[PDB]
Amino acid sequence: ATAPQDFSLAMKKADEIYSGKTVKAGDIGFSAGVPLETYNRKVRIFCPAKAASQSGLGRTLHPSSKAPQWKIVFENLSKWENPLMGWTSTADPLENVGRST
Amino acid sequence: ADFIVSKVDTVVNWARAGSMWPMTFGLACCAVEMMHAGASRYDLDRFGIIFRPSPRQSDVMIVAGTLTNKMAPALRKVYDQMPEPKWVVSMGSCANGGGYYHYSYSVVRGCDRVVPVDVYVPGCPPTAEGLLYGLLQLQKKIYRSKNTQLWWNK
Amino acid sequence: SYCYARKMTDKDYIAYDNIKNFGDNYLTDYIIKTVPKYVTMAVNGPAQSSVLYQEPTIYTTPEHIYALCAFLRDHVNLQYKTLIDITAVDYPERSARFEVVYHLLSPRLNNRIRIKVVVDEVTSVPSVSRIWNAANWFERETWDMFGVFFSNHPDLRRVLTDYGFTGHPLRKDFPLTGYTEVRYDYGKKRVISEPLELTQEFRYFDFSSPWDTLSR
Amino acid sequence: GTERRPGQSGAWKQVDKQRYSSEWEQDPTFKQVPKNVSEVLDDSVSVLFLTDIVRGMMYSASGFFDDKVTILYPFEKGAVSPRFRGEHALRRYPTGEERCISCKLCEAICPAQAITIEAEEREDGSRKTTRYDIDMTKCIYCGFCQEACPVDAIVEGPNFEFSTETREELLYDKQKLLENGDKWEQEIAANLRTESLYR
Amino acid sequence: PKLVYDIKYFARDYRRNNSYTVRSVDSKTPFDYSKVFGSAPLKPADVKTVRIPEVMPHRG
Amino acid sequence: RVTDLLIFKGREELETYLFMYKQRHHAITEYIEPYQIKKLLIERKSSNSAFLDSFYEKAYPLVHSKYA
Amino acid sequence: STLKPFDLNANNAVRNGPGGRSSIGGVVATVFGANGFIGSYVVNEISKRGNQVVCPYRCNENKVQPLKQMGDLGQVVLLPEFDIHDDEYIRRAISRSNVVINCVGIRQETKNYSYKDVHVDFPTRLAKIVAESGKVERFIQVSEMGADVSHASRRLQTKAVGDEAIMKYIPDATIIRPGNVVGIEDYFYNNLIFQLSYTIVAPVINNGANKVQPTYILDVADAVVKILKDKKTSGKTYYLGGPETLTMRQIYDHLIDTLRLSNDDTVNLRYELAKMLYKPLDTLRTKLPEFPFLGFMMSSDYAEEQVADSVAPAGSLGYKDLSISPAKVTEGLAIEGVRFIRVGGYD
Amino acid sequence: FKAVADVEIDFSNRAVLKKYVGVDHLSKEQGTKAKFIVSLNSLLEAVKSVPETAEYRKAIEATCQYRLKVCGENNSDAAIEEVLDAHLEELIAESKEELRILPVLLESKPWDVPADYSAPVFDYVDASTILDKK
Amino acid sequence: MKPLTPSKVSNFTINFGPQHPAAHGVLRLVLEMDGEIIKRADPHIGLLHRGTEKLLEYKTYNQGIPYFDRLDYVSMMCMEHSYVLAIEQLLNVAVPLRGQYIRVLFSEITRIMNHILAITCHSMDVGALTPFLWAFEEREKLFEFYERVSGARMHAAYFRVGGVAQDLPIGLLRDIYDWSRQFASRVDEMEELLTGNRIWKERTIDVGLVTAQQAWDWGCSGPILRGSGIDWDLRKNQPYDVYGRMDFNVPIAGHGDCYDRYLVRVQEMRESLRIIYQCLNEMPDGLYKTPDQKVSPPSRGQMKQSMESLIHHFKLFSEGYHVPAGETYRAVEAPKGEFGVYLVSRGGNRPYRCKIRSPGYAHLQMLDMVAKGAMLADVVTIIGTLDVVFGEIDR
Ligand SMILES: NC(=O)C1=CN([C@@H]2O[C@H](COP(=O)(O)OP(=O)(O)OC[C@H]3O[C@@H](n4cnc5c(N)ncnc54)[C@H](OP(=O)(O)O)[C@@H]3O)[C@@H](O)[C@H]2O)C=CC1
Ligand code: SF4
Numbered sequence A: 001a002t003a004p005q006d007f008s009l010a011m012k013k014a015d016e017i018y019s020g021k022t023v024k025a026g027d028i029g030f031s032a033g034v035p036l037e038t039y040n041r042k043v044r045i046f047c048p049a050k051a052a053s054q055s056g057l058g059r060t061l062h063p064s065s066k067a068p069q070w071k072i073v074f075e076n077l078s079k080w081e082n083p084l085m086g087w088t089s090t091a092d093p094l095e096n097v098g099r100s101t
Numbered sequence B: 001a002d003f004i005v006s007k008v009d010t011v012v013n014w015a016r017a018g019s020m021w022p023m024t025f026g027l028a029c030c031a032v033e034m035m036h037a038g039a040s041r042y043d044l045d046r047f048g049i050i051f052r053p054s055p056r057q058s059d060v061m062i063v064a065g066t067l068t069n070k071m072a073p074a075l076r077k078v079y080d081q082m083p084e085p086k087w088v089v090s091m092g093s094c095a096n097g098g099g100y101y102h103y104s105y106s107v108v109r110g111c112d113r114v115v116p117v118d119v120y121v122p123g124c125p126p127t128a129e130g131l132l133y134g135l136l137q138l139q140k141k142i143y144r145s146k147n148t149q150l151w152w153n154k
Numbered sequence C: 001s002y003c004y005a006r007k008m009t010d011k012d013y014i015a016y017d018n019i020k021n022f023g024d025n026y027l028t029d030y031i032i033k034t035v036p037k038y039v040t041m042a043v044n045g046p047a048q049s050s051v052l053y054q055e056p057t058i059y060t061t062p063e064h065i066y067a068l069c070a071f072l073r074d075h076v077n078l079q080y081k082t083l084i085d086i087t088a089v090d091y092p093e094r095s096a097r098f099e100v101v102y103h104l105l106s107p108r109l110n111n112r113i114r115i116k117v118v119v120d121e122v123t124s125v126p127s128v129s130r131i132w133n134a135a136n137w138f139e140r141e142t143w144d145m146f147g148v149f150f151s152n153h154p155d156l157r158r159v160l161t162d163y164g165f166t167g168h169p170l171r172k173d174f175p176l177t178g179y180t181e182v183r184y185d186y187g188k189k190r191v192i193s194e195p196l197e198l199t200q201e202f203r204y205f206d207f208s209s210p211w212d213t214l215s216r
Numbered sequence D: 001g002t003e004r005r006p007g008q009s010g011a012w013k014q015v016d017k018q019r020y021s022s023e024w025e026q027d028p029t030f031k032q033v034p035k036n037v038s039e040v041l042d043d044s045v046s047v048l049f050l051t052d053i054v055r056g057m058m059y060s061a062s063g064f065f066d067d068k069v070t071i072l073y074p075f076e077k078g079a080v081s082p083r084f085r086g087e088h089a090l091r092r093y094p095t096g097e098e099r100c101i102s103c104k105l106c107e108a109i110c111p112a113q114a115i116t117i118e119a120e121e122r123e124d125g126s127r128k129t130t131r132y133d134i135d136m137t138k139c140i141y142c143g144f145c146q147e148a149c150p151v152d153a154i155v156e157g158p159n160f161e162f163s164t165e166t167r168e169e170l171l172y173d174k175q176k177l178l179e180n181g182d183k184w185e186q187e188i189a190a191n192l193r194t195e196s197l198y199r
Numbered sequence E: 001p002k003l004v005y006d007i008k009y010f011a012r013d014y015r016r017n018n019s020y021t022v023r024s025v026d027s028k029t030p031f032d033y034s035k036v037f038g039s040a041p042l043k044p045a046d047v048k049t050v051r052i053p054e055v056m057p058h059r060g
Numbered sequence F: 001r002v003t004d005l006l007i008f009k010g011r012e013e014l015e016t017y018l019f020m021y022k023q024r025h026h027a028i029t030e031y032i033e034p035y036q037i038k039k040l041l042i043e044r045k046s047s048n049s050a051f052l053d054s055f056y057e058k059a060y061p062l063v064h065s066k067y068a
Numbered sequence G: 001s002t003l004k005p006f007d008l009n010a011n012n013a014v015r016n017g018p019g020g021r022s023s024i025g026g027v028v029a030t031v032f033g034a035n036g037f038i039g040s041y042v043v044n045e046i047s048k049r050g051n052q053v054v055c056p057y058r059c060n061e062n063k064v065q066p067l068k069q070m071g072d073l074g075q076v077v078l079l080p081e082f083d084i085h086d087d088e089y090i091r092r093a094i095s096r097s098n099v100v101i102n103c104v105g106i107r108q109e110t111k112n113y114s115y116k117d118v119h120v121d122f123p124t125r126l127a128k129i130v131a132e133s134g135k136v137e138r139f140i141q142v143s144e145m146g147a148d149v150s151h152a153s154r155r156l157q158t159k160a161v162g163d164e165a166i167m168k169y170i171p172d173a174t175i176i177r178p179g180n181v182v183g184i185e186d187y188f189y190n191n192l193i194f195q196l197s198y199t200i201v202a203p204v205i206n207n208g209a210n211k212v213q214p215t216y217i218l219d220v221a222d223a224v225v226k227i228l229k230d231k232k233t234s235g236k237t238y239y240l241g242g243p244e245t246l247t248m249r250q251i252y253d254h255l256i257d258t259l260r261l262s263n264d265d266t267v268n269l270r271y272e273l274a275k276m277l278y279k280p281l282d283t284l285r286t287k288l289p290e291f292p293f294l295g296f297m298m299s300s301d302y303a304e305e306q307v308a309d310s311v312a313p314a315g316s317l318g319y320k321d322l323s324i325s326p327a328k329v330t331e332g333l334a335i336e337g338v339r340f341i342r343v344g345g346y347d
Numbered sequence H: 001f002k003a004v005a006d007v008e009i010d011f012s013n014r015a016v017l018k019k020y021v022g023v024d025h026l027s028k029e030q031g032t033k034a035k036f037i038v039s040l041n042s043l044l045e046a047v048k049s050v051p052e053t054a055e056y057r058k059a060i061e062a063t064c065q066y067r068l069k070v071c072g073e074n075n076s077d078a079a080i081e082e083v084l085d086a087h088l089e090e091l092i093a094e095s096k097e098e099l100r101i102l103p104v105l106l107e108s109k110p111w112d113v114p115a116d117y118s119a120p121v122f123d124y125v126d127a128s129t130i131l132d133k134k
Numbered sequence I: 001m002k003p004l005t006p007s008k009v010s011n012f013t014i015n016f017g018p019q020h021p022a023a024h025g026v027l028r029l030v031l032e033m034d035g036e037i038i039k040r041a042d043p044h045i046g047l048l049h050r051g052t053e054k055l056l057e058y059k060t061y062n063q064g065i066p067y068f069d070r071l072d073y074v075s076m077m078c079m080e081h082s083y084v085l086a087i088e089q090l091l092n093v094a095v096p097l098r099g100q101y102i103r104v105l106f107s108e109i110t111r112i113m114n115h116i117l118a119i120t121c122h123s124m125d126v127g128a129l130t131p132f133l134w135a136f137e138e139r140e141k142l143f144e145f146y147e148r149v150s151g152a153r154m155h156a157a158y159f160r161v162g163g164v165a166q167d168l169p170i171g172l173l174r175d176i177y178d179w180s181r182q183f184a185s186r187v188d189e190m191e192e193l194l195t196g197n198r199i200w201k202e203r204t205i206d207v208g209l210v211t212a213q214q215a216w217d218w219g220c221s222g223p224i225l226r227g228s229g230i231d232w233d234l235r236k237n238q239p240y241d242v243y244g245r246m247d248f249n250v251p252i253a254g255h256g257d258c259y260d261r262y263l264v265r266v267q268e269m270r271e272s273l274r275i276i277y278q279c280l281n282e283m284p285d286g287l288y289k290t291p292d293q294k295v296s297p298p299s300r301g302q303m304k305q306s307m308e309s310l311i312h313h314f315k316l317f318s319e320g321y322h323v324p325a326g327e328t329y330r331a332v333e334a335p336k337g338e339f340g341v342y343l344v345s346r347g348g349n350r351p352y353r354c355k356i357r358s359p360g361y362a363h364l365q366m367l368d369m370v371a372k373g374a375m376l377a378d379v380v381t382i383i384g385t386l387d388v389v390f391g392e393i394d395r
């Protein structure tokens, strides 16, 4: 809670020096070049709760935690089993991007 | 007549399998292992496999490398220019199933999506002896065919 | 300047003492004092050249990048004749998402410098191709991968991605597998692009520990 | 040798420069004017008689008679070290019990995500896999899975002749991997005994 | 190896013991050119050279 | 600014065809064929509303359908 | 547009996915004659949507190579040794199949197989084998438009007899009856072109009066898909004629125009003369193997089927009932294949 | 360094060396001491446009004075090359390269900043320094 | 009132497709030519773009080493070396001397194989096929050393963070030393056939001329710099391993033409042989990987006997080490030039951004300037001297 006193110092300082120009909502999505049906998907902005198995507070929103913890996640879609090998097949392009990055 | 047709078909199989003119689609890592397989230490020209630069004069095609979405039309175009027998060998994990770039936006998961594949050579890169094993597997596949007997009994 | 071969024997030295000192410890202060308007902040950190030394990183704004680069190349004391690469890093948490990074070499100083320009999706960065001819392809790649527009570029075109690709793949919001897939159709004797289907989905393994502290 | 003639060059503009200017006589790499009659005859016979060509001809003709280096691939096989990473194989204990304990580290370390594992408690009570399949069209044969396994259950065997005629046969499963381990057991065991000394 | 029976990582922990200090630089204070060029050689004899580092750091 | 970026990208799309980066089959696949398919399409005007048709088709409407 | 299910019993349970190559369709299909011109496109349509297709073929690895690419892993099953006279093999082929499509037919006779064998005996035996199973839900048979019991040509007569036998054994079977099919691998335009260019004279039976309704291969393949996606189509015969009806003279003229032939190479080989020139050559065919030099065109059966109007009956089912608009075969993508040869700006 | 030419040439001639390594491409002029003096004095005249109390101008003045001194004690042109670690030709080209950017610096005037300008500087401290000793 | 003078127009916008006697890989090259002379060259790349940089972001640091082996299939060791050096800098890990020696040794070996392939494939593109086959036997001899140390002839993945994957097998140093005793004679055999040959001289002299200013302007490195008169080597100017101890001389040429770069590459092979001999004689004894087990896996007997070693093995083969937040760019003197990795870490077990700096990317950019005024035949030679690898260019 005091200070990381490491590269994060310069990271935050670069954050506060610079800023982004305001644009109308949704305009950047057209610039992105992805299929427009991507934005029809609904978004949940949440912070994961602590796993009950472990007692560490890093993943939680705690003054100890210095990492980004708020995720954008998209709703879960259909999943099936590969007829030949029983692998989990999917057609959702946004399956793991939000959770992972 | 049934004996003569068999002698003819086995002679044709010997001719096709002994003289394989392969065209090498050397995209990536595996092309150098093929280079080594056709080098002095392994003599493919003793086996009768001698590489031909143009598709029209080649009967076997070896896809050795990572197929990309940018290349797949050119791969299909080269394959179509080949004459009728046109056997295709898939070499390497990249060509077989996309391999280590399988979960990529720009990579085709296996040349089988674009062109039919007769023999799959596994490896990253496949050892030269493994490539010769796959070529012998293709030669056995050619030997197995008896086209002239079926023409007689068609 | 240009490290033309001069000494035939006994050039065992990595460089002279004064040249090392001026760049080991006075380089950032010299840059800030000489050209203060261009520089906004400076970071001294682990060295690009070696593990033991330290090289500067300078943060500047997009408007001043061309003049700062021209000063860096042709200043007598600082002769960064080479542009190693141009890169962008996407930080979605920030309002100004993209940090365009310039890496330079001074053969005379035997030193490396890193220049960062922080922009967003709409703003553009002036091209530095007139200063370094190598920039042209690097800026084309940055435009392709991240979508950063470079102003006054001689011909800004995509390089790596497939023809007709509209998305920018290295953006953190772009799916790892993408949106489309390529297949040959027998009916229409053409190779065609289709929406993505995966036989086996990419398996993300969450390995993060609660007890870790290094994550910022 | 390294020395170059004013006439021989690959660029038209350089040929024009050397034909109409004498800066080539200043340059050290070039060959200087003969300055004697005998030197003129020497250069003239060297160029006109293709002397340098014949010198290469003898060295190439040495190729005809020297010992050929080649291997008859079916009859003779190239040397293969114990460390060689080839076709995968699940292993069994000498009692006949599979070494795998479904730790799933090999699936976590797989750079290519070629291993899918799912397990259960067996009726006796052991931790055993109900599924262990490897995609050999996705494998990169790095050997990381052999490094991560704590019980030596998964090893990359010494077999490189495993080409197939259809892609479906290249999707291995637990039974196939166990059969491959049974087939190559003694060779794998010898290779592991040799490798244990180093690591 | 003296690490077999003597285990102390915190003494040998270099990964997590790095930090970043902060300074502020201003244009008002003049740069010290005496440091840069006072130590510079004026004749060939006074030339001093930095030798190439032979090895990179190792724990031994 | 977004308009400028969109115009630049559209100019790139035109230049690909103009400079022969893309091929004849690309033009067939991506523009001409879908337009001709749309003209040749005969469909029965569904009495069921939009909700009912998607309900009959699939559980998750957001997932795309191929070869509809 | 909303994807329509394959109307097969218990399909709703098994089906899952968007309907693409990697999706699961609840259709397992045994397409006899898969390596043929018609069969390959039907296999492509069924397998493209994630379904599994069993393709029995007479041993020929190079001929069945395109079918390998058609589907994902394990979806296209190629059975090596297919014989029309082997019952046990037919039972094995349709063991897991819930739809069976029969595209097996011969344009010409040989010594080994006659019309009566392939077009009559095989349909009856296969019909019995499918009937005894019960798992097979849909049966589709492909026949010519001009097939009739009272037809001079033996091919078109045997085909109609076989269709009647199939209708007798399986009452719910659908008889697809397309016209002359145009495609890249077709035997209509390709044979006409070969006749115009590498033959000394192009004999035209009568003056080309006979009317025909050619259709594009993609249209027939889509019609097959629409048959399988509707259970109400069962037990009905569909005459899949093309959008436009053309006499053979118009088609010959338009091929000459598109190819930019110097002049007209077609000659008038009127009927009652082909019936004397080719009549011995049919007996020649029945005692000799398949020969590329002479075939199909040079037969009395072809002359007999080119003296009648092979057009759809007025009251009949067609593309409109399947909600398909057939594409014109004289323009657009359909005509590209002949167009590539020469257009007068080419070579 | 090692010459890759089989022909035998003398590298102590101090002209065959320059011809071999291709300094003539950089400048066709011989590059004598007087040219270096003229170039430094021309740079000093040029940097007069920059305001007198500008840090850039002070830097250029100091560098030019240092090199004019190095020219002073060293009467040998090769000695100047040894002290400055450069060929005289590239030393002369250096001042012209400095001359090219004076117009670009006079258009934006980087030296103009407010009297409260402050550039934050972040410095890295190595763990090896603290762990071994203090 | 003085007449004006008109000019001429250029056409023939040819497409030079993937072509086998050229630098290996697929090259699509669009050339605008006035007659038989080239006026513009526009290389089309992306035909082997596999999205490597983005794939790295989804993998752990140890899971991403084989990517660098496969970036350049000709020179694997040098490519993975920069990645492991960057991770070591961020992790503050010190490599033991034996592992440093092994890295330098194998880097020189891969340098030699790279130069053999470059020279002999360039000669093949010219049209001489004997040096090519004469070289494969040597390259096989070196691939057998690779297969001995790692079990893979090409994609070894031998270099690891903090050292090497396994120790040198017993008997290896003798075999390498024998290969070294005969290497100089083999190189002399190749050099006699190539050097001094009139057709080779005519084909290569004064083709692809580059000047020192041009090389620095376009960001070129390695043989291109050293063939123009630039005494710049990373192994000497910015040493990264026990290279500083090693005694070798930079090869320098001045013309900048194709012939000069061929001579430079041959001399680089000889210098690498000298460095290998020094490595062999001075090879130390001791640890080959770092003693720290929070960044390197424990040995197998040690994990099977100690609880802490089993914990470290489990957490290193499942989660991996956590790299402190920071950025670094580490470059190595690859055989093709300067190869560098710009690694951005936010403190996790996966790289946030891993930019790969291609030495061949800048050379292919320089192609247009170099191949101005040339002929259709000269393009193959110019491509040969650049020695571009398109998997390396297209990441
Ligand atoms: N113009 C057209 O294309 C039209 C076609 N049709 C009908 O559709 C059917 C097929 O069309 P098409 O595909 O053009 O004909 P093809 O001859 O092109 O396809 C015939 C298929 O039947 C197989 N076959 C033939 N005889 C036998 C046999 N005795 N035993 C086993 N397999 C056999 C062939 O295999 P192999 O290759 O080994 O002989 C081939 O796969 C025919 O009945 C035809 O009348 C309907 C309207 C028009
Ligand atoms: S399979 Fe491996 S060796 Fe072959 S091209 Fe792909 S990455 Fe390279």
Ligand code: SF4
Pocket (backbone or CB within 6 Å): D106, D109, D110, D111, D112, D113, D114, D115, D134, D138, D139, D140, D141, D142, D143, D144, D145, D146
């Ligand atoms: S060798 Fe490597 S890629 Fe193959 S299964 Fe093992 S860990 Fe995965």
Ligand code: SF4
Pocket (backbone or CB within 6 Å): D099, D100, D101, D102, D103, D104, D105, D106, D107, D117, D148, D149, D150, D151, D152, D153, D154
């Ligand atoms: S093979 Fe080894 S690493 Fe993989 S699950 Fe079994 S015991 Fe674990």
